[PDB]
Design a protein around this ligand. Structure first.
Ligand SMILES: *Cc1cc2c(cc1C)nc1c(=O)[nH]c(=O)nc-1n2C[C@H](O)[C@H](O)[C@H](O)COP(=O)(O)OP(=O)(O)OC[C@H]1O[C@@H](n2cnc3c(N)ncnc32)[C@H](O)[C@@H]1O
Ligand SMILES: *Cc1cc2c(cc1C)nc1c(=O)[nH]c(=O)nc-1n2C[C@H](O)[C@H](O)[C@H](O)COP(=O)(O)OP(=O)(O)OC[C@H]1O[C@@H](n2cnc3c(N)ncnc32)[C@H](O)[C@@H]1O
Ligand SMILES: *Cc1cc2c(cc1C)nc1c(=O)[nH]c(=O)nc-1n2C[C@H](O)[C@H](O)[C@H](O)COP(=O)(O)OP(=O)(O)OC[C@H]1O[C@@H](n2cnc3c(N)ncnc32)[C@H](O)[C@@H]1O
Lengths: 553, 553, 553
């Protein structure tokens, strides 16, 4: 194809054409869409691979020149080798459902979006004795689930899913996303991964670097196709430098396979809901959660959900008030009463044999009872369309899609995640929450959020919903985010993850000792990708060809 | 003036004298010893910092030209730029008690050993709600146990210790070393770490990149002295590339501070011994352990110890036998009848409330019953002198040095570790034990070794004890080590950790795809340390100034 | 031509086309086949110049982009100059019958296969007083023979041929192949050669560097066309460095002419066969051969042939057993009796006047008689289709093609040579033979082999035959070879020659002092071929543009 919508940096239209024609020759026209005109948002079921479907910028700000779907790893080696020849940036996606953080879109306009999971979608292995799987990019959570369910494996191994099943297992891991069983730190639960580097070369990290001994049936296989050794996915460190983190939220390589640990079926399980009546209950509740989480009475990643999250699953805004402006604290309580919920709602789960669940539940019951008005529930005890029935599945690794609903709080709706980290402390959870709220009212948005409760640590996921056709809200949303980053960085809170538009501003928060951390990351980046091929601008890590003057926001 | 026994590569006696003069001035000659006469092996109590105290190669083969001890970070910075000026290799050490792996000797003879711990020994912070501490290299496990006792803090926070409590908490963590509570994975339990790079700039990882908000009290501090932000030592990842691992088992920088997570007091503890009468009971032992550990009954890192390991603690070889050759199986299980131990002996522990510890004990106890003639004891049930009583201190974070006794198994005692990783597979462990044993007896040694029980992996620690005034036995020791690597690599096991002399050969077992892993690191190494200053050859990672034909072993 | 089947490294399809069109302009379309689709194996009579006809890899693994047939040396200078312009690797063949070692195929897929002998096939000189010839690449053995036979020269000069006449005289020399008269070391018997270097330049080695003095009839000639001096082909060293070996089994240049010594007609000759009954007779026989070879009672390169070699010439496998699996030792003896042969069969020849042949034959008779059951034969004494009648020709330099037959032991048959060197020692010949056999039974192949008996030295030519359409045998064959290289390198035996697929693994056997020899060869290679044009990957000698990570096997 001939005349794309945007060109990447430096590139002559003839150079594009020589390049995109050399690739039609490798993947076939089957596997190459050049983007030549109007770049539609689509849906969660048909994820757009061209731009950010939940656009806070102009719809076309983050935009591709072309989508390329390699068949196999060898093409990936070729496509990278070819981008070096032509100085052509690439943006690896596995699935492209990174909505809230920019969807499938590249940082540098005109990049090839490299669809790794169209073709490479194979669940390569499920091992029961070692309690692990191995996956290519295209393997979603529903996929991996469906595979398990087909093979009578639900009784022996369980998944850990995020809120929505459509995500990449692999993509989410490298992003360091959060799920909700014991194995919720998707990244911690990885061992042994494969990567194609900017220079073309295939690499296996950890014990993947220990080769599988030669034997009759493995001969003649191409690196990508070769087996792994005994310990590859059992123990991630191997010998020497632990390099695996260089490919999480970074642009040092292209991940082709990953090993993930799966919790074994516990032989017993109990979801539950603790409802917390007053808005100020947050403070004491956190303080009660702290030791329970630290001593493993909270075994999984329970969440503390602001009432508007649960309410937005059950309806859009306009089904509660025909009001323009953020609902009042007085209204927020009326909604809570209508649904049999607190202003905050603690969702969580118990795991193991029942004498053990007994004990820990007796502990949790007792501990939360210090709050006035506290009410406990099991799935049994709730109506059929409740959030607890959804999270009963989620907290035993079962893919749902019901949480999407909260994207249509507002017409033409789109989310953006502001995700500062907080202490498991009342004072700290309350202050940060109070800072976040003020600013959403200042921008005229309803606060919607949730706390994913890590071990010593909470990811506070602020769920900024906005009418994506309302351009005055967009600019207010942008103002909200840029301000919230500074507000929170001014109180010692950083962000674990962002949208394309905020990657630079947030990497400027991590500037202890005159941008030390960024400068070291650049040294590595420029060393392993001399040409600046791989996702330039990812996590604010620009290679040496991109003036930081022009490209940062 | 100063005339040292060896000099680093290519470096004039005058250069050396000028270099040290500068340092002696910067640091004061209390903190400089030059190595100018015939290099004492030393004790654990006061460890040598010149050469390998447990020497498998010649005593003078790994030998430092001098030893420097920085007063503070600044001195490290100053020393680094001075090493850069001169192409002078530095070898960082924390405490130096890394014996069985070389201790504090360098790879390259002529290197300066950089004793970090001598001066930089302050428990910078303990933190009760965050359940963490922050330490300099000089904070030993005992220093830190000491600290918590002084402040009556063991009611609220426990430790996790190696078999001996004189290691560096920092230095052990960066070697991915191992303890035996449920925080036994020492590297995995860090968060936030300070590092001086080869260019001498400071760098803090994770949320250590987020600076603590500028206030009037902390103003005008140096970077080394600056407080960390709220989330520093709570959430390890921060934002963007997760570089923490590049400073583990590596030569990418000098670590000055590290956060470690502390397991809080369970509120209930009880160690236990299970004896396994027969040698063959290992397969079924492992096969039963596999699922008990995956499902988290076995909460800590338990240990399966060969009879001789335990016996070597209670007494030396001579105490049990005048035999020159290795002790035979008839004699070995005689020692089991003497001591009321098995051929193998399982040590593990139970944590948390009485009702829970009951339920897990029941199952552990009734699952292990499938091995014929098995037995069960608590600390109380055994002798006052027994090993369980000792390990009862170890698996609650109380340091001992009682485990040092098995080194004196032979006269002129010196340990050395061969540490392959096994599947949690009865068949696998046995086939590994059988290879390890086979080469021990050809080498003329008593097999001694404990398995550690990780989640999906076991570190099989082969405990090579030898007489070091016996030189015939050192050549056979060397032969043994170099062979067991290649043997185990030929079966698909790799080593997590080694002695100096085996780093080049072991990095060569990780040669999947024509030494791709090693090639990637070398690229990282040369980017971040242009002058090859820091610890060349550490993990066989040679910077471009050291030729692979001259320096590989 | 426009769209080739595979492209070489880096190369845009437009670049290929500019390049292959500039060459159609030099050699004509007469002399350029671009390979645009399905790459057939062909036969010995019609040797394929596209790929390896005896493929152990996938048929298309080693594959060309194009075949170019230079007319004359000047084109060769042009084609090299043009490959430097475009960075286009070239793979020089003379004839392309290097079957067993990869046929005509290149190492790097997409190279031009440079057909040197299509056009340049002229026997340039035959000198009788100096007893030598001079040949271009296309001069085969049958050719050179036919030329001699046309010119009434059989009475004065004799050839030395390998098993098959179709080979290049020149190509085999530079490979260092083996023939079977006194002049069997084809490489030793060279003096004065011509080469085109990677930089374009024509060079004459040895005394070829001494120019032929100016005289009337030699004026205006282009370097290639010029005469040689008096001593050129009479004495190979010349003055200064003996550089000739840089163009044997290497990629330092393109050989355009070579001088070869021809044995003069001895004036008397007697082929013979000594049959050795038991399989274990090998041991003693070798020991008897040793002094006879060392004192020139064995004047030529006699061979010790395993009975299955002789039997495979006389029939395929299926004419002896309809059995899948390797014939038993019990069956191997039944075949031997049926054909009037030993388990081993010693073929050899006597040369000179009959009183001299008498003496040496009386010596050989006597010496071999120490073996029980030994039987001597002349050609007279054997049936017409016997191997001795074939080797009666071979050992007086007469081209045959009868040996091909053994390629059809198995259906769809193809050979591969495993060619370790051995001592003229029984213990050593027997061990190596015993190692080789075990492994062939492990792979389920019949051992077929022969020992070419050099002076102090045997080339043990293992004749691995395999059904080339049976993909499970292929992988077994690959396993056999990769294992046999290590087995034999583990006992001090290296290989004198290999297939494309094994060149890297075998150059890794020659790694004394941390790959010293390879590293020096690279220094030279990168010096004389800066662009990496000439046969990159030949003998595992990769230039600096090819990551050793990607290209080695
Ligand atoms: C809208 C929404 C989103 C959401 C959620 C609830 C709602 C209503 N709940 C989430 C949760 O509980 N936990 C969580 O981690 N995320 C949640 N989200 C966000 C989103 O649904 C998921 O995170 C989703 O898994 C992310 O998208 P996807 O799985 O499709 O991953 P991707 O878009 O393909 O990749 C994102 C980025 O990762 C890097 N990447 C990906 N693949 C590679 C390869 N192969 N090599 C190198 N880098 C890779 C790129 O930077 C890419 O852009
Ligand atoms: C003899 C012995 C050893 C032993 C053991 C039992 C016996 C009888 N049991 C162990 C166990 O159960 N678990 C374990 O992990 N190790 C065990 N060992 C070995 C040893 O005693 C301990 O591991 C000890 O804690 C390690 O020694 P130390 O803590 O003193 O570390 P070091 O001497 O400084 O050397 C470690 C290496 O790491 C690098 N390093 C260290 N500090 C730095 C800094 N600041 N910067 C950069 N690199 C650093 C160096 O390469 C150094 O050599
Ligand atoms: C199947 C078979 C093969 C065989 C044999 C018996 C059987 C049944 N017996 C042999 C024997 O007794 N002795 C021996 O040396 N080889 C034997 N073989 C193998 C094969 O038939 C011959 O070796 C044959 O002579 C080799 O093929 P050819 O003569 O065609 O040479 P080539 O394929 O063209 O060249 C091979 C490689 O040499 C380098 N080369 C060649 N020409 C050049 C020039 N002009 N410049 C630079 N390098 C050159 C290349 O590496 C080329 O690939």
């Amino acid at each position: 194809e001939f005349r794309p919508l945007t060109l990447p940096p430096k590139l002559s239209l003839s150079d594009f054409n020589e390049f995109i024609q050399d690739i039609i020759r490798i993947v076939g026209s089957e596997n190459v869409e050049v983007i030549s005109s109007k770049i539609v948002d689509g849906s969660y079921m048909k994820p757009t691979h061209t731009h950010d479907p939940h656009h806070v910028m102009d719809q076309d700000y983050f935009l591709a020149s072309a989508i390329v779907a390699p068949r196999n790893v060898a093409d990936v080696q070729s496509i990278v080798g070819l981008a070096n020849k032509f100085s052509f940036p690439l943006w690896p996606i596995s699935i492209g459902r990174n909505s809230g953080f920019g969807g499938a879109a590249p940082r540098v306009s005109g990049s090839v979006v490299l669809d790794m999971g169209k073709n490479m979608n194979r669940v390569l292995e499920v091992n029961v004795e070692g309690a692990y799987c191995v996956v290519e990019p295209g393997v979603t959570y529903h996929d991996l689930h469906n595979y398990l369910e087909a093979n009578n494996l639900r009784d022996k191994l369980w998944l850990d899913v995020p809120d929505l099943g459509g995500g990449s297992v692999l993509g989410n891991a490298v992003e360091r996303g959060v799920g909700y069983t014991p194995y919720g730190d998707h990244w911690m639960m990885h061992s042994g991964m494969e990567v194609v580097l900017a220079n073309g070369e295939l690499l296996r990290t950890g014990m993947g670097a220990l080769p599988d001994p030669k034997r009759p049936e493995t001969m003649g296989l191409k690196p990508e196709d070769q087996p792994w050794s005994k310990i590859a996915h059992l123990f991630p460190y191997g010998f020497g430098p632990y390099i695996d983190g260089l490919f999480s939220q970074s642009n040092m390589g292209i991940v082709t396979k990953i090993g993930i640990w799966l919790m074994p079926n516990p032989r017993g399980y109990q979801s539950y809901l603790i409802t917390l009546p007053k808005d100020g209950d947050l403070k004491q509740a956190v303080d009660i959660i702290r030791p329970l989480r630290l001593g493993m009475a909270l075994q999984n990643v329970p969440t503390i959900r602001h009432i508007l999250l649960d309410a937005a699953v059950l309806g859009d805004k306009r089904s509660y008030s025909s009001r323009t402006e953020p609902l009042s604290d007085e209204e927020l309580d009326k909604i809570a009463k209508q649904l049999n919920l607190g202003r905050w709602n603690f969702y969580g789960a118990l795991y193991g044999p029942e004498p053990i669940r007994r004990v820990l539940w007796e502990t949790i019951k007792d501990a939360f009872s210090a709050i006035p008005g506290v009410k406990f529930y099991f799935p049994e005890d709730t109506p059929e369309n409740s959030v607890l029935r959804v999270r009963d599945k989620t907290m035993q690794g079962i893919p749902t899609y019901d949480e999407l609903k909260w994207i249509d709080w507002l017409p033409n709706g789109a989310h953006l995640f502001f995700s500062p980290i907080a202490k498991v402390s009342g004072e700290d959870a309350m202050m940060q929450y109070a800072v976040t709220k003020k600013r959403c009212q200042e921008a005229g948005l309803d606060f919607i959020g949730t706390f994913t409760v890590g071990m010593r640590e909470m990811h506070h996921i602020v769920c900024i919903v906005f009418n994506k056709k309302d351009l005055i809200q967009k600019r207010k949303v942008q103002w909200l985010m840029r301000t919230l980053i500074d507000d929170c960085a001014a109180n010692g809170w950083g962000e674990y993850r962002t949208h394309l538009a905020f990657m630079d501003q947030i990497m400027e928060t991590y500037n202890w000792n005159n941008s030390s951390f960024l400068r070291f990351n650049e040294v590595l980046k420029n060393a392993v990708d001399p040409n600046g091929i791989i996702a330039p601008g990812k996590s604010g890590v620009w290679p040496s060809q991109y003036s930081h003057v022009t490209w940062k926001l």
